[PDB]
Design a protein around this ligand. Structure first.
Ligand SMILES: C/C(=C\COP(=O)(O)OP(=O)(O)O)CO
Ligand code: F3S
Length: 309
């Protein structure tokens, strides 16, 4: 069985920085370090950091006075940031810069009292943080997930309206939502295409190329990783069996029985060690040397804050 690897796959710049912020805080200050939400949506990265003394909580009221608190890469609402500020924690912010960029646009629209629409998935933490940049009661902040939600939405002033997106969406699905927004609200303003990040766009482009060669696609990533779920979904819509897996133990041999070409990719929050162990399992099940596909170059790095070097 041929094993193919998508390119690019695995860690993005945001994730690499976020994990280093927690590791470097643990190195500089010792355990414990509190982290609001899973730093990135990857069980191995989270369990790893847990075993090292990071404590993952969901609410600032779970964090003791005097503690060091790190906001996760997904970002936080103003109400969360203000809560932490009023508690006098020591706070470091691991929010990906490309999520902060969207936050600054929502804040700008709130200040202007002009309505904004976010395209994203309800209950995802990045959505909760981005919607939570909008504070002005005179305006409005609305979430839509599909064209159906656009066809139900009414706003106060459609002549002064903007949109933004979550970073880790399907590029194709998000384009359909934007088409519906522009048809319903022709004066809406937004970025040229969407706020989907480079890493999400590139991994989807790479899984499309992978799925055109492979019969079955394995995506290394956790169940609550949006970007990882988009990669498995993209391959399934091409007609390929595709499975989201945390690690090699999740591989069912029936999935690759008499398969001549299996493709492996990984979401932006999945470490390469997991991919290596998945490739070693697939070789136990009859696979050959893993062949990486040619792919679009990534060259972005985001450094940790100076105070955490
Ligand atoms: C931090 C982040 C992306 C990195 O991968 P994650 O898997 O942590 O997050 P997501 O795909 O959005 O569920 C932006 O939400
Ligand atoms: S928003 Fe940031 S954390 Fe990664 S998946 Fe995109 S570069």
């Amino acid at each position: 069985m041929q094993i193919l690897l998508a390119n690019p796959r695995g860690f993005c710049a945001g994730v690499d920085r976020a994990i280093s912020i927690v590791e470097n805080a643990l190195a500089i200050y010792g355990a414990p370090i509190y982290v609001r939400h899973e730093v990135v949506h990857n069980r191995y990265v989270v369990d790893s950091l847990r075993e090292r003394g990071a404590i993952f909580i969901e609410q600032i009221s779970e964090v003791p006075d005097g503690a060091i608190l790190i906001f996760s890469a997904h970002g936080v609402s103003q109400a969360v940031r203000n809560e932490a500020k009023s508690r006098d924690l020591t706070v470091f912010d691991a929010t990906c810069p490309l999520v902060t960029k969207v936050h600054m646009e929502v804040a700008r629209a709130s200040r202007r009292g002009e309505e904004s629409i976010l395209i994203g998935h309800a209950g995802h933490p990045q959505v909760e943080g981005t919607m939570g940049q909008y504070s002005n009661p005179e305006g409005g902040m609305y979430l839509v997930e599909s064209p159906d939600d656009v066809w139900k939405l009414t706003v106060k002033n459609e002549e002064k309206l903007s949109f933004m997106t979550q970073t880790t969406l399907s590029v194709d699905d998000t384009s359909d939502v934007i088409d519906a927004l522009r048809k319903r609200f022709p004066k809406i303003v937004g970025p040229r295409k969407d706020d989907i990040c480079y890493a999400t766009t590139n991994r989807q482009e790479a899984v499309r190329a992978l799925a055109e060669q492979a019969e079955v696609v394995l995506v290394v990533g956790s169940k609550n990783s949006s970007n990882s779920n988009r990669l498995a979904e993209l391959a399934q819509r091409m007609g390929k069996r595709a499975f989201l897996i945390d690690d090699a133990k999740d591989i069912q041999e029936e999935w690759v029985k008499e398969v001549k070409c299996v493709g492996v990719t990984a979401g932006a929050s999945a470490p390469d060690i997991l991919v290596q162990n998945v490739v070693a399992r697939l070789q136990q099940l009859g696979g050959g040397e893993a062949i990486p596909l040619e792919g679009r170059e990534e060259n972005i790095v985001f450094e940790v804050p100076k105070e955490l070097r």
